[PDB]
Design a protein around this ligand. Structure first.
Ligand SMILES: *[B]([O])([O])[C]([C][C]([C])[C])[N]C(=O)[C][N]C(=O)C1=[C]C(Cl)=[C][C]=C1Cl
Ligand SMILES: [Cl-]
Ligand SMILES: [Cl-]
Ligand SMILES: [Cl-]
Ligand SMILES: [Cl-]
Ligand SMILES: [Cl-]
Ligand SMILES: [Cl-]
Ligand SMILES: [Cl-]
Ligand SMILES: [Cl-]
Ligand SMILES: [Cl-]
Ligand SMILES: [Cl-]
Ligand SMILES: [Cl-]
Ligand SMILES: [Cl-]
Ligand SMILES: [Cl-]
Ligand SMILES: [Cl-]
Ligand SMILES: [Cl-]
Ligand SMILES: [K+]
Ligand SMILES: [Mg+2]
Ligand SMILES: [Mg+2]
Lengths: 196, 233, 213, 200, 216, 234, 237, 239, 130
């Protein structure tokens, strides 16, 4: 069961996600990626029900890309988060609700870094850090304990590592590897996977 | 001005008669049916050396056993070809067998008079298709060539030309055709005739040729295979 | 809670031979603990080369055979030939699946001749899964018949026996025996056995008496 | 059912059992669970027999249309996505399908798991069906990208076999296929009773 | 109908040489209440065909309306074709199946009797579209109490005269009055022959109560 | 002129020029003939060939086991109407488990084909049919027209030079009822032969034959299968 | 809804609405396309000049997706509708096939949109032709042209709009393996081709390039008049 | 011009498309109805355009309900479509109200349907006139006639088609109020023979139907022997 | 009905759309309306046609419309048509704000309305907006 985490520093956002795709009692994939690139400076991280997660994430992705092609510049993180929200809320009482939980991470030339949290009901909250999954229950207090708004990117990767080590120790599920990426003024960077 | 479904005093639909005239603006295409297979040959009609000849496709595969040659307003042919393709795949889906050439031709021909402006969907067909088609293939009846025009009339032919020089080409076909003719003779015959009727000097880039045979699937001739056949002619 | 289904019983069987196919069924039509009629066979002629057996909910048996009959004519009209055994089977698969969310409560077995004149059997589940078999039992007593056929036609679990071709006269003698055995133990199977033999010469019919209790 | 597939240096191995069941009644021992979508693409079937065979046949139709319209072989990614998008509309309606889409295209050997819950994932090895857990154990202890061809055939065969032994719902025969760069080949069909004789 | 309201009980039918006879009591019951004690549950469809209905009486009246109007529509054409008993039976099979398949059945079980071209026709159709033909029929409790007597007679003698079929129907109606708590001793008998369809009634059966004094 | 483009426009003489024009489509079709005896209904058609290397257009179509048609006029309209007839026949077998009576089918065609003659932007059907059938009332030959009117016939011919064929059929019709099948088909073939230029003859390439009756489902004879009927026009 | 049949046949097989739409294309500004070896270049005329214009707002060269772009000639409002439809479609393709479109796919899509508006009630045809360029997954460069009828072909080089006849004549004599051996010469071939028809040369040529993978670069006036001088002084010699 | 559409009045307030449709009726051969003491009798001059047609082909007398007959003149395919409208209106009346449609109400309903085709460019007026006849003990004998404008009136006697006036002048000679249907059929046959122009049109069939006390209120074809006697009376009366 | 249809959405023989051109003639007769961009702002200045002595002066302008928080327009042509378009402009701008929670960029608003105007020249058989 799926884990997402985001940490926003002064000029970057760091994100990570587990790499497991599971089914019944087996891990069926150990290099799964739960991140979707929306634009040069926007990642959507999406978990939840099978089928709804990809269908929803890719629809949003394609529409964000379309906006870029029509207009010549990109949606800001905030505008993308609100677009994501409107779609999810608008479907909530429809014949096709999407059962998805999301983080949206982004860097805007003028607003700086942003991290947004959304649940399946489509409540949207901006946050300095956030997490989804059962794993969030064991890691949010580690983030409250050690996060500061000026946290450097090296220390954010350390803080991330403390959370991921806590899942190894204390969580009942076998989540042995995580995708890590950072977003800043120069776009989206892949970091090394954190593995156990 | 009158509606698109108006009859003339001779009992023809004006729009169909005018669609039939548009076929005469097309390049010449030829089909010949033999006991060893059918061949389809068509003049490309290159208008500039800057054009890529391989982007002119006037012969297309419908299914492995069925090809189609077209003449007239080529853009109109796209929905007809697509419909032939979808129908053969539906028939395979439902019945787990190949659709006969006659049956494909029939299914397409049921589109022909489906135009008009006050029975139908919010923007349905406003006019007939300006296209004639030769369907050539092999089914359990053996090799077969069928012709269809914008009236929706379709019929089997032993050999048939369509397009601009079709009279002319059809006379030469009467002259050379026989029921026991081989496929290789039909190929040569159809290129000799294209060569007569074409304004440009025939060569291996300004024509296309395809065959279907009881042995073998729809086959578009490559440049090199065209060049080989062109030597004798 | 009106139920749209009821179970009406019936046992079907088909056997492919080298140059024949047998389709057989009992003729009892039941409901609850009652018999509706002793003379309701479960086999229906489709073409000169193809017979279908249908059991289960009789309301759906009737409807589905009428739909098949209409679709055979429609095919013949648009393609100018009779449907083959194989094409009938592929078609039936799609007709069954069209009701995937309110199924035809029918077990189908097609018996006939293929395009080389060999015996062909196709067996179906109610929503349209199918395959070609060498023989197959269906319906109420299928679990009683199928093992005997596995053993005696398929030669399964036997050592030291020559795998000879199945003659018509042995297949017939098998078909009568398994139904007689089924009528001993399945309450739904009884009254009479109807056998259709499909060969190049056409389709012929035998009927054998079964127990009436 | 037990089905499995794995990518390796020489393509993709695909294997299945052949049993169908209606509750605990064995309805067939001779089901073909590997569907030939085209000469370069296989699908496997596990779950509802009608559901798998309908939707995979429909996938075959659509792949063929695609090929006629675009004048090129469909990619394994695109085939698997067509299937995923077709079944997604039906989630919640009780479809039961677990499929592997197995080919070789311009990205090389290709393997995707697709099911009626809406999953679609690429990967190196998968097993699907009620016997999958048994197959995983054996497949996982023997698998390597650098398996020789015959070692790979041996592994697939043995994994399905072991699943047929533990799982009441898997049996019959082991049917084995190999997707190579110039097309798939059917490699063998071995009855489980004959494989038992051999493995002891 | 989801919930039947006023209902009728068994309908009987038996073929005889030169025709068919059907029987049905004249009762519409409302639960256990014998509410409407003089209603006909038999319809003359046309000259060759008659219909008896069990189950919901309003649904029967709707079928009567629809089928009656169909026969009128056909007679307007005056073209030498009429619906046979078999055709009517087919139509009814389809109508009932179709209503079942919309999860909104017509809550009836019917017996179609007819005579056409020298053949007796007797057919059953139920609310689910289950339909078949047989030399005798009995819906409801008739299936348990009447049909055994019918079939036992028919085995010993498959071809009955008109007066034998009629005596046999009277015996079955008596048994039903004894043993079906929703029956009533007031019934109609309808007969179809070469000459057409006749409906007789109201009829009653004699009953014997001697067993009331054989308890001690 | 102002009255001849729209099927909704009555002329001042109480005519509809679009209906009349649609009837011209039938007069220019190749001839066909229909006739009947006490027990069989026969259709005979001439097939026109576009070139010496073309097959010859289909003129006779299967509707149901007891019904076939012959066509003259726009082929696409013939197929549309034939498909409607097929479907009405399938419906009657599905619902009533018996063949649709031929005259009821023909009433259906009349009602169907009338509708577009009264609505703006629609057009008549540009096809005439001869309909051969057998039912409880015996054999039938009916004729349908683009006007939506239809006719119950002892015999009939429509298409080009069909007047000759009608004259022949009037001349011999008192014989038709008592003819055996062979006689009846020959009479159909001779009527059809009257429609031809003096040079030309009936051949196995240009003649098509349809037969239905008491003992015989609707059957089409083409190509080599017509040779028996053509021999002994003696 | 309005269902009038707008595009109909006339005697002798003409579709007058389509021919009239082709007249609108001919009054549009000249557009030119050349397919290089590892580059593709579009250039377009004018259209009106005018010092008070914001130049950014009237480009006739448009990205459809990262790997495909287009120029058009004809009715600019009509073009905008086609361009936005093609952009939506590129995103459907990426959705359902997870590859970018080929240039041929999107060309085929545009062409069949155009064909449909010649055969559907209530609509007139689009008054545009388009030159569509880019690269396929395997690196092959591509130039396609569509016209109002819905016909489309691939070209080594081509022009549409006013003066297309003479610009095509020039390309026919000047398009050789030499003239496209490099990027600069390919770009120069387009400018020379325009400079034949371009009123007050030039000044008002807009130009854009697409390199294998590297995505659409529009050249700025400073970068253009560099090539203009570099070609004009070579033609003295 | 002012005569192309039923949605266009002329400057004198006429609807020429309706008047042209009426001309179609006036070109057709003649049909008559007569109401009498105990029912209504219809007769039609049915012109035989070819000897190849069967006796009975192209009927102009229809049953629209078991108690209602219809007699037509004009474009026959339009008349048949109107017969089907009338049939459906009768059928739907019985289904909704539970009894046989009264004649006058049936006439007024189909008249309004006819009238609806005289307002619009989207459709053309029916090219037919028709009579409706019935009888019941409660309502007596009733004969209505409806024309292409949709006007509907009741009549003692009525004629439509091309010898309309010649027919009416003969019908006026009868005291139809005091005559029975059996006497009237002969007079109907007689009048059709009077107004038939044997020079201009060579061959016709007489078609006869009736509804009255003698048919128990059912609309029926006149039996063959009565029709033959009536023709013979008419023919010898022509003398 | 084909006789009465004036065919507002078809090409003329030179590839022109006459209704569009005729509409542009109506505009050329309306009040003069100019726009001027500066470094610190933008302006609209328009001729008033509503100048009769007895007019009552009840709105804040005659031809200047606020579209949203950051935009305004002026118009030349048929006034009632302008009321329809400006109302549609306000709707588009609020649909965008709803969806993205930021104001519509200027050129995207203009483009969105222009696609409506374009559609009126291509299908529907209606007169364009003047
Ligand atoms: B396997 O998943 O165990 C197998 C795969 C298919 C392709 C054969 N599935 C089954 O056997 C599941 N059974 C059925 O779908 C079924 C249902 C019914 Cl109602 C009747 C017979 C059968 Cl086989
Ligand atoms: Cl031609
Ligand atoms: Cl197997
Ligand atoms: Cl596709
Ligand atoms: Cl994946
Ligand atoms: Cl009562
Ligand atoms: Cl009754
Ligand atoms: Cl014809
Ligand atoms: Cl035609
Ligand atoms: Cl007529
Ligand atoms: Cl004629
Ligand atoms: Cl579209
Ligand atoms: Cl151009
Ligand atoms: Cl009159
Ligand atoms: Cl605002
Ligand atoms: Cl705003
Ligand atoms: K038993
Ligand atoms: Mg859902
Ligand atoms: Mg018992």
């Amino acid at each position: 069961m799926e884990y997402l985490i985001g940490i926003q520093g002064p000029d970057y956002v760091l994100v990570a996600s587990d790499r497991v795709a599971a089914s019944n009692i087996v891990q069926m994939k150990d290099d799964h990626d739960k991140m979707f690139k929306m634009s040069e400076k926007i990642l959507l991280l999406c978990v939840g029900e099978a089928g709804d997660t990809v269908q929803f994430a890719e629809y949003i992705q394609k529409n964000v890309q379309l906006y870029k092609m029509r207009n010549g510049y990109e949606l800001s993180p905030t505008a993308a988060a609100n677009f994501t929200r409107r779609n999810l809320a608008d479907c909530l009482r429809s014949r096709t609700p999407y059962h998805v939980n999301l983080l949206l991470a982004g860097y805007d030339e003028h607003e700086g870094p942003a991290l947004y949290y959304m649940d399946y009901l489509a409540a949207l909250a901006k946050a300095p850090f956030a997490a989804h999954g059962y794993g969030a229950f064991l890691t949010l207090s580690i983030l409250d304990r050690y996060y500061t708004p000026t946290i450097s990117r090296e220390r954010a990767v350390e803080l991330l590592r403390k959370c991921l080590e806590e899942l190894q120790k204390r969580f009942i599920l076998n989540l042995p590897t995580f995708s890590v990426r950072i977003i800043d003024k120069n776009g989206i960077h892949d970091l090394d996977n954190i593995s156990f | 001005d009158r509606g698109v479904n108006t009859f003339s005093p001779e009992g023809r639909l004006f729009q169909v008669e005018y669609a039939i005239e548009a076929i005469k603006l097309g390049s010449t295409a030829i089909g010949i049916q033999t006991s060893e297979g059918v061949c389809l040959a068509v003049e490309k009609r290159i208008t500039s050396p800057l054009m890529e000849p391989s982007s002119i496709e006037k012969i297309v595969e419908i299914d492995a056993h069925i090809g189609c040659a077209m003449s007239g307003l080529i853009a109109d042919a796209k929905t007809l070809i697509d419909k032939a393709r979808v129908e053969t795949q539906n028939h395979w889906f439902t019945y787990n067998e190949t659709m006969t050439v006659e049956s494909v031709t029939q299914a397409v021909s049921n589109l022909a008079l489906q135009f008009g402006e006050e029975d139908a969907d919010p923007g349905a067909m406003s006019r007939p298709f300006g296209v004639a088609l030769l369907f050539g293939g092999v089914d359990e009846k053996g090799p077969q060539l069928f012709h269809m025009d914008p009236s929706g009339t379709f019929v089997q032919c032993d050999a048939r030309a369509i397009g601009s020089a079709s009279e002319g080409a059809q006379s030469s076909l009467q002259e050379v055709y026989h029921k026991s003719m081989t496929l290789k003779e039909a190929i040569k015959s159809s290129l000799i005739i294209l060569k007569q009727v074409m304004e440009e000097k025939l060569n291996a880039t300004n024509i296309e040729l395809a065959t279907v045979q009881p042995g073998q699937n729809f086959h578009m001739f490559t440049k090199e295979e065209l060049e080989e056949v062109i030597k004798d002619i | 809670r009106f139920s749209p289904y009821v179970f009406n019983g019936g046992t079907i069987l088909a056997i492919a031979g080298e140059d024949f196919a047998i389709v057989a069924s009992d003729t009892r039509l039941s409901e609850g603990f009652s018999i509706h009629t002793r003379d309701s066979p479960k086999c229906y002629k489709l073409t000169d080369k193809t017979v279908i057996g249908c059991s289960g909910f009789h309301g759906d048996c009737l409807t589905l055979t009428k739909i098949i009959e209409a679709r055979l004519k429609m095919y013949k009209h648009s393609n100018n030939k009779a449907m083959t055994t194989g094409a009938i089977a592929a078609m039936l698969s799609t007709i069954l699946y069209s009701r995937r969310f309110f199924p035809y409560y029918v077990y189908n077995i097609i018996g006939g001749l293929d395009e080389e004149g060999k015996g062909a059997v196709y067996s179906f589940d109610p929503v349209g899964s199918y395959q070609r078999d060498s023989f197959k039992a269906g319906g109420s007593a299928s679990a009683m018949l199928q093992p005997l056929l596995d053993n005696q036609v398929g030669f399964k679990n036997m050592q030291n026996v020559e795998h000879v071709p199945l003659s018509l006269d042995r297949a017939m003698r098998l078909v009568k025996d398994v139904f007689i055995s089924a009528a001993e133990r399945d309450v739904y199977t009884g009254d009479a056995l109807r056998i259709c033999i499909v060969t190049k010469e056409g389709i012929r019919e035998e009927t054998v008496s079964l127990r009436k209790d | 059912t037990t089905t499995l597939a794995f990518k390796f240096r020489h393509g993709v191995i695909v294997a299945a059992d052949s049993r169908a069941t209606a509750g605990a009644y064995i309805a067939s021992q001779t089901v073909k669970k590997v569907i030939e979508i085209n000469p370069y693409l296989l699908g496997t079937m596990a779950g509802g027999a009608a559901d798998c065979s309908f939707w995979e046949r429909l996938l075959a139709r659509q792949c063929r249309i695609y090929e006629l319209r675009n004048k090129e072989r469909i990619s394994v990614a695109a085939a698997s996505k067509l299937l995923a998008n077709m079944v997604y509309q039906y989630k919640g309606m009780g479809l039961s399908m677990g499929t592997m889409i197995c080919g070789w295209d311009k990205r090389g050997p290709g393997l995707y798991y697709v099911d009626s819950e809406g999953n679609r994932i690429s990967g190196a090895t998968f097993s699907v069906g009620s016997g999958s857990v048994y197959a995983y154990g054996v497949m996982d202890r023997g698998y390597s990208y650098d398996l020789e061809v015959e070692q790979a055939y041996d592994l697939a065969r043995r994994a399905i076999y072991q699943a047929t032994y533990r799982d009441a719902y898997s049996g019959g025969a082991v049917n084995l296929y190999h997707v190579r760069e110039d097309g798939w080949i059917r490699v063998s069909s071995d009855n489980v009773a004959d494989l038992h004789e051999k493995y002891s | 109908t989801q919930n039947p309201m006023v209902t009728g009980t068994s309908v009987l039918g038996v073929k005889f040489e030169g025709g068919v006879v059907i029987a049905a009591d004249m009762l519409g019951s409302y639960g256990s209440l014998a509410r409407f004690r003089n209603i006909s549950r038999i319809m003359r469809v046309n000259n060759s065909t008659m219909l008896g209905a069990s189950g919901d009486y309003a649904d029967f009246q709707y079928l009567k309306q629809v089928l009656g109007q169909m026969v009128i529509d056909e007679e307007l054409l005056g073209d030498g074709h009429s619906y046979s008993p078999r055709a009517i039976h087919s139509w009814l099979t389809r109508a009932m199946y179709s209503r079942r398949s919309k999860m909104n059945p017509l809550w009836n079980t019917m017996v179609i009797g007819g005579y056409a071209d020298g053949e007796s026709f007797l057919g059953y159709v139920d609310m689910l579209g289950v339909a078949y033909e047989a030399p005798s029929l009995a819906t409801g409790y008739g299936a348990y109490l009447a049909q055994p007597l019918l079939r036992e007679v028919l085995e010993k003698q498959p071809v009955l005269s008109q007066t034998e079929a009629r005596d046999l129907v009277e015996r079955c109606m008596r048994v039903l009055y004894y043993r079906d708590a929703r029956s009533y001793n007031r019934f109609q008998i309808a007969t179809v022959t070469e000459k057409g369809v006749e409906i007789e009634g109201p009829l009653s059966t004699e009953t014997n109560w001697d067993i009331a004094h054989m308890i001690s | 002129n102002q009255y001849d483009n729209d099927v909704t426009v009555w002329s001042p003489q109480g005519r509809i020029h679009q209906i009349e024009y649609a009837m011209e489509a039938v007069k220019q079709g190749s001839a066909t003939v229909g006739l009947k005896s006490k027990t069989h209904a026969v259709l005979v058609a001439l097939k026109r060939a576009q070139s010496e290397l073309a097959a010859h257009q289909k003129k006779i179509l299967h509707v149901d086991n007891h019904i076939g048609i012959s066509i003259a006029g726009l082929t696409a309209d013939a197929r549309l109407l034939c498909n409607f007839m097929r479907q009405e026949c399938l419906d009657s077998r599905f619902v009533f488990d018996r063949p649709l009576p031929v005259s009821r089918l023909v009433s259906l065609i009349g009602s169907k084909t009338q509708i577009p003659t009264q609505r703006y932007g629609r057009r008549p059907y540009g096809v005439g049919l001869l309909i051969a059938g057998y039912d409880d009332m015996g054999p039938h030959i009916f004729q349908t027209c683009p006007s939506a009117n239809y006719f119950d016939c002892r015999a009939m011919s429509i298409g080009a030079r069909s007047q000759s064929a009608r004259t022949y059929l009037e001349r011999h019709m008192s014989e038709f009822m008592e003819c055996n099948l062979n006689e009846l088909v020959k009479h159909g073939l001779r009527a059809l032969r009257e429609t031809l230029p003096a040079e030309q003859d009936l051949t196995t390439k240009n003649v098509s034959i349809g037969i239905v009756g008491k003992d015989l489902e609707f059957t089409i004879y083409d190509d080599d299968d017509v040779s028996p009927f053509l021999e002994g026009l003696e | 809804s309005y269902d009038r049949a707008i595009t109909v046949f006339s005697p002798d097989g003409h579709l007058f609405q389509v021919e009239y739409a082709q007249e609108a294309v001919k009054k549009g500004s000249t557009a030119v396309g050349v397919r290089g070896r590892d580059i593709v270049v579009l250039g377009v005329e004018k259209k009106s000049v005018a010092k008070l214009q914001d130049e950014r707002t009237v480009r006739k060269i448009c990205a459809l997706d990262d790997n495909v772009c287009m120029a058009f000639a004809g009715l600019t409002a009509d073009a905008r509708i086609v361009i936005n439809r093609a952009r939506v479609e590129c995103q459907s393709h990426r959705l359902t096939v997870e590859d970018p479109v080929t240039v041929e796919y999107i060309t085929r899509y545009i062409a069949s949109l155009k064909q449909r508006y010649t055969q559907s009630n209530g609509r007139r045809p689009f008054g545009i032709s388009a030159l569509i360029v880019g690269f396929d997954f395997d690196g092959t460069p591509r130039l396609y042209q569509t016209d109002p009828s819905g016909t489309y072909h691939a070209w080594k080089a081509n022009a549409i709009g006013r003066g297309a006849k003479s610009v095509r004549e020039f390309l026919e004599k000047n398009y050789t393996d030499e003239a496209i051996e490099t990027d600069d010469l390919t770009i120069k071939l387009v400018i020379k081709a325009l400079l034949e028809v371009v009123q007050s040369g030039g000044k008002n040529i807009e130009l854009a390039v697409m390199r294998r993978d590297q995505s659409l670069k529009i050249l700025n006036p400073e970068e253009i008049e560099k090539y203009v001088a570099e070609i004009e002084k070579e033609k003295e010699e | 011009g002012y005569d192309l559409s039923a949605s266009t009045f002329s400057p004198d307030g006429r609807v020429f498309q309706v008047e042209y449709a009426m001309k179609a009726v006036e070109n057709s051969s003649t049909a008559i109805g007569i109401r009498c003491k105990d029912g209504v009798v219809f007769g039609v001059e049915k012109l035989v355009l070819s000897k190849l047609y069967e006796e009975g082909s192209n009927k102009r007398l229809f049953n629209v309900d078991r108690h209602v007959g219809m007699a037509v003149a004009g474009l026959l395919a339009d008349a048949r479509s109107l017969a089907d409208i009338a049939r459906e209106e009768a059928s739907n009346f019985r289904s909704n109200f539970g009894y046989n449609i009264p004649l006058k109400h049936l006439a007024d309903r189909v008249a309004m349907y006819v009238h609806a085709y005289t307002l619009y460019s989207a459709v053309r007026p029916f090219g037919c006139s028709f009579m409706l006849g019935s009888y019941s003990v409660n309502d007596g004998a009733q004969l209505y006639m409806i024309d292409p404008s949709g006007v509907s009136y009741g009549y003692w006697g009525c004629a439509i088609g091309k010898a309309r006036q010649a027919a009416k002048t003969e019908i006026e000679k009868l005291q139809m109020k005091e005559m029975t249907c059996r006497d009237i059929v002969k007079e109907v046959a007689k009048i059709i023979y009077i107004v038939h122009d044997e020079v201009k049109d060579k061959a016709f069939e007489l078609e006869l139907s009736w509804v009255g006390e003698l048919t128990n209120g059912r609309h029926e074809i006149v039996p063959k022997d009565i029709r033959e006697e009536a023709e013979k009376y008419a023919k010898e009366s022509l003398k | 009905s084909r006789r009465y249809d004036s065919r507002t959405t078809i090409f003329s023989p030179e590839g022109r759309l006459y209704q569009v051109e005729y509409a542009m003639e109506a505009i050329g007769h309306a009040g003069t309306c100019l726009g001027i961009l500066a470094n610190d702002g933008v302006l609209l200045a328009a001729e008033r046609r509503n100048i009769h002595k007895l007019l009552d002066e009840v709105f804040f302008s005659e031809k200047i419309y606020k579209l949203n928080e950051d935009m305004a327009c002026s118009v030349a042509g048929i006034t009632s048509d302008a009321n329809v378009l400006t109302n549609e402009l306000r709707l588009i701008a609020q649909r965008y704000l709803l969806q993205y929670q930021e104001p519509i960029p200027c050129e995207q608003l203009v483009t969105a309305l222009c696609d409506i105007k374009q559609a009126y020249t291509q299908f529907g058989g209606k007169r364009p907006f003047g």
